[PDB]
Amino acid sequence: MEHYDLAIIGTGSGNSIVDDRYAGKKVAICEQGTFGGTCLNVGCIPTKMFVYAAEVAHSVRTSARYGVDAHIDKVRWPDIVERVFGRIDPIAAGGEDYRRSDPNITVYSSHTRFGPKTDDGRYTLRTESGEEFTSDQVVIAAGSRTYIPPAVVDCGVKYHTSDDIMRIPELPTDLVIIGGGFVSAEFAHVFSALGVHVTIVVRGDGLLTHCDETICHRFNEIAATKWDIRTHENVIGSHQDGDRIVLELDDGKTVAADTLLVATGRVPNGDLLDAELAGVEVDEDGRVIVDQYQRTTARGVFALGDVSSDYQLKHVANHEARVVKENLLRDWDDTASLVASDHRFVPSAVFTDPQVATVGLTEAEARAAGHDIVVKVQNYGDTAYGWAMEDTTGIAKLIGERGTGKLLGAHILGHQASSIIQPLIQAMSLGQTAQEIARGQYWIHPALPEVIENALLGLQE
Template sequence: MPATTFDAIIIGSGQAGNPLATALAGAGRKVALIEENRLGGSCINYGCSPTKTLIATAERLHQLRTAAQVAAPETAHAADLRVDLGAAVARKDRVVAAMREGVRANLTKKQPNITLFEGHAAFTGPHALHVALATGRTQGLTAPLIFINTGTRAAIPDVDGLADVGYLSTTQLLDLKELPEHLIILGGGYIGLEFGQMFRRFGSRVTVVESGPQLLEREDDDVCRGLQDALGAEGVEFVLNARAHSVSRSPSGTITVSATTSTGERRLRGSHLLVATGRTPNSDKLGLGFAGVKTDEKGYIPVNNNLQTNVKGVYALGDIHPGPQFTHLAYDDYRVVRDALLHGRKRSARDRPLPYVMFTDPPMARIGLDEGQAQDKNVPYRVATMPVRTIGRAQHTSEARGFWKVLVGKDDRLLGATLLGPEAGEIMAVIEVAMAGRLKYQQLQEMIFAHPTWAEGLNNVFRDLKKGGK
């Protein structure tokens, strides 16, 4: 069958690919969009949306169980509430299905210039692809512009016996209908901690095994300690400095993780094992060699400031290129390319603001530099830290765990902030806007915020600025 020519081909319907397809089609370009799995990419199908939906269920259960702290003693029986995991998963599935159907409708019913191909794509040349369709047919496609938006999958560590025990990826755990008795999690990063607290609140015993000396290797020590204390108070167990070297399953189904720790050999036994040790790019089956597209030693596709690969006309968007892996950055990749191709405005994808939130309870939010980064880059700074319990709203709600930490430069402008506490992501957004507007910290310190809100804490957090450094 002869190849069909398009103006642009997009491989992967993630948070960069979908809006780009819509924008190009709206500008009159003939667009082919190829998706091998489910429309919407990782965020909608097995990332942000399903995870945060289940976390919301766990949080609601926790609020009901702890209602006696702020209500009449008669509510104490709520402490016995248990999750119906099957019902929680069914609700998650309904949320995800509605979002996925919305994506399909937008791409197919509202955009006559978009042709959707459901199947696996592989390059046969710099601007040519072969698509093995789900129907069993094949289709050749060509275009002067090709955008790779194929994302990542779970990285599986090299641990003896792991492949034989029936471990769970985060995708599989999201569909589990029966509550694990004891969930062991390999990996104390953002994903491991969110899932750990979630399943602890669902009722599982949870043990997090982390190879490093602390959780969240990219965060300041005080943030890691604060999160470990908060989750530990709810019963999540942590084994740090522990390198898992073998995994086995007994005839009765018990999983044993053997790990070398700083205090000697540990054997951890549980009913289920979640592997949350990072991600690896989906670049190995794209036939990139036929196109001449280069990858780095980890399989990611390097790009320039405009998200172009080493091959002219071929771009890499989202998690498939090196750098932080966040949905909002993938969406901004779309905006960088859209502006360059359709509006004649070029801006760099380098050194963009990097806001992110971890949806534990208390949540953790970051924008700009933290202390470790400022010290590594030799950036002079002053730092102030304020306990959340001093904010009036915390006293009203009894949500008093955590602290806010802000960094200020020599010119009195904000360098960054790390917030651990209720509504951390929303407060971080206020700080990000102030940073974008290059406001000096005194303007936030003197600003009138409605009382009593969490944002009101911005009047006080800068009160005790001290010179930072080692």
């Protein structure tokens, strides 16, 4: 019989768990699909890669705006796909040899359930891969999986999410997109920059109704002038009609396009473990119960982001991986000095046209929290940039508590959003105020971040 000291499933951040410290144990990291979890092969890392191809293919489109003329000539879609996913296929087969070919660890193939605890209290793990093995401690990453509404299970039309549409063999002539959220808004810009009309069919009223209000506003009012935005219009079902896919719409007006897309949201993958038997709560989501220290209800076993966090992102996953790989040594005894995850302020970034990056709380949140607010919206304009790009619609909305000047969540759309929210992230996370950032440091001028200046300067303080 085989038995390890520590086990892992997903390796989004689960490959970061293996460190020194242990260095002399038996470890298994049974990964089911490509080593890297959801991070490198399907989720965060593989995205944002096509984005630069799209950004060049968009700057050529907008070249006329800057006294420049440029032609698309030809689109090397095969070369773009091989440049993106020809980079992460051998590297994927690299973090796997880390824990297969190399000694004190051994990894197997897909499937990793849970089994009844042994009489001596150890954790049982089951592969449907003709094998069963127990261990002492097992941490679960198991990434996340995109979710398709029943409209696809009533037909069988070929569907694509973030998992596969980046490796589609051909560039469509006309594309359908459904979903208003994180996973769906990137491909709209990414593809439309490469010469395809996309047809957005959401389930609410507009795109991404779970972000900033005064950012949803001016993202709707630029997405309308590029993509076909159908509002509610709940897709009732689909029926293929030869070539060209046609979905049936809530108001009868059936919509047609070449290729399909879905990705309305994600769900964690804790259910597939049947942890109900091993005394672990999963709670419908797949989220798997944890706490501050990512500690579940069973001993020695833990979980990480996506599968468990309240943010399905890799930075929170890395902090949770930090506390996981650290807490298997500072035993569950001392709830102090056991090191807890940072589940305060986190940034989210959706790279579309234009980019968007948010952090902290929105106006609705702080108004529901009872504080009086000094919100400002700085136009990507009055800076010495703005006019250099003829940027008319880019904005950075910054929220701060009055009296003291405590910034509480920024929301920026326009050129350079992620590398502009980062000063605001730094100020947010560790006891920085607002004026401090404003007139306590130089802003190079005419550097891009100058917006923050007029974003912070004009506040109450």
